[PDB]
Amino acid sequence: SFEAIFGTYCNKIEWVTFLGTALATAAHAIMFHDLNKMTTGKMLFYIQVPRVATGAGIPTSRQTTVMVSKYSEKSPITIPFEISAACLTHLKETFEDTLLDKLLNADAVNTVLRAVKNTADAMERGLIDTFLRVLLRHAPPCFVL
Amino acid sequence: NWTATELLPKLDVPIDLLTHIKLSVGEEMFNNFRLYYGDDPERYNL
Amino acid sequence: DLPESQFLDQRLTFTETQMDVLKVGERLVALEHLRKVYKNTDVQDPLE
Amino acid sequence: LTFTETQMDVLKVGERLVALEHLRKVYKNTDVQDPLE
Numbered sequence: 713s714f715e716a717i718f719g720t721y722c723n724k725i726e727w728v729t730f731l732g733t734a735l736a737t738a739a740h741a742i743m744f745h746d747l748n749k750m751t752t753g754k755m756l757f758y759i760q761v762p763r764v765a766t767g768a769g770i771p772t773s774r775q776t777t778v779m780v781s782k783y784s785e786k787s788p789i790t791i792p793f794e795i796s797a798a799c800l801t802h803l804k805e806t807f808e809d810t811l812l813d814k815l816l817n818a819d820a821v822n823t824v825l826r827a828v829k830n831t832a833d834a835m836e837r838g839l840i841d842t843f844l845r846v847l848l849r850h851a852p853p854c855f856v857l
Numbered sequence: 858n859w860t861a862t863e864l865l866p867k868l869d870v871p872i873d874l875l876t877h878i879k880l881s882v883g884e885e886m887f888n889n890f891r892l893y894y895g896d897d898p899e900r901y902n903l
Numbered sequence: 904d905l906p907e908s909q910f911l912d913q914r915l916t917f918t919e920t921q922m923d924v925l926k927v928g929e930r931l932v933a934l935e936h937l938r939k940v941y942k943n944t945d946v947q948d949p950l951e
Numbered sequence: 952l953t954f955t956e957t958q959m960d961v962l963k964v965g966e967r968l969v970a971l972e973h974l975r976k977v978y979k980n981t982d983v984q985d986p987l988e
Contacts, residue, residue: 761980761981761982762977762979762980762981764977764978764981764982764983765982765983766983770983773982
């Protein structure tokens with residue numbers, strides 16, 4: 713008699729990106745590199761108002777000028793991954809190799825690549841999440857709007 | 858032997874779920890599973 | 904007026920993706936499952 | 952008197968053509984409210 717393990721299958725993950733979704737059609741997405749070096753990004757909006765006035769008793773206003781300095785909002789994300797010290801040992805040792813070292817070493821390479829790979833997937837997803845949560849926290853309910 | 862899965866190669870396939878992958882083992886879509894969060898050093902012990 | 908404001912003049916390598924668009928009020932509105940990034944994940948879908 | 956052309960939303964009632972007009976487009980962000988209100 714025998715146990716007969718069949719085809720050892722695997723998933724391969726759904727390769728999402730926030731540009732690839734429809735969130736970046738609402739997100740003007742900009743890489744910037746001194747963002748750890750910046751504090752709070754200001755924006756000046758210069759705004760004229762119109763000046764329609766008439767009448768004899770009606771209070772005619774002055775020309776009114778409005779600048780508003782609307783601020784940015786930091787909201788960093790951080791996902792953890794981890795690579796085992798056994799994985800680092802079977803990478804950095806690379807000992808007297810009778811092919812069970814080489815299988816294990818290629819496994820360690822694929823382990824680190826798989827972990828960083830899924831980590832970047834998590835990075836994309838987390839950017840999806842915090843962009844969505846910022847839209848929710850700065851989007852009123854539409855009965856209010 | 859889950860090491861024989863996670864160490865040997867596999868087959869990239871499209872999968873499907875009713876609810877959720879970690880709920881698939883807690884609400885038990887399948888029994889005799891294996892779940893692990895930190896990358897296992899046991900598969901490195903041959 | 905600046906012909907190239909700094910957020911405006913952001914050059915980009917365009918591609919396409921098959922987005923579920925709909926016209927309402929003569930405003931082309933896309934429509935998006937974020938199910939693809941929240942399936943089999945720990946994070947609850949924030950639209951829920 | 953010289954002329955020009957403009958895109959007016961005109962309507963037909965009783966074989967009489969009648970123009971139709973938004974005035975919010977001149978009373979947006981204005982101190983004077985719209986007298987049609």
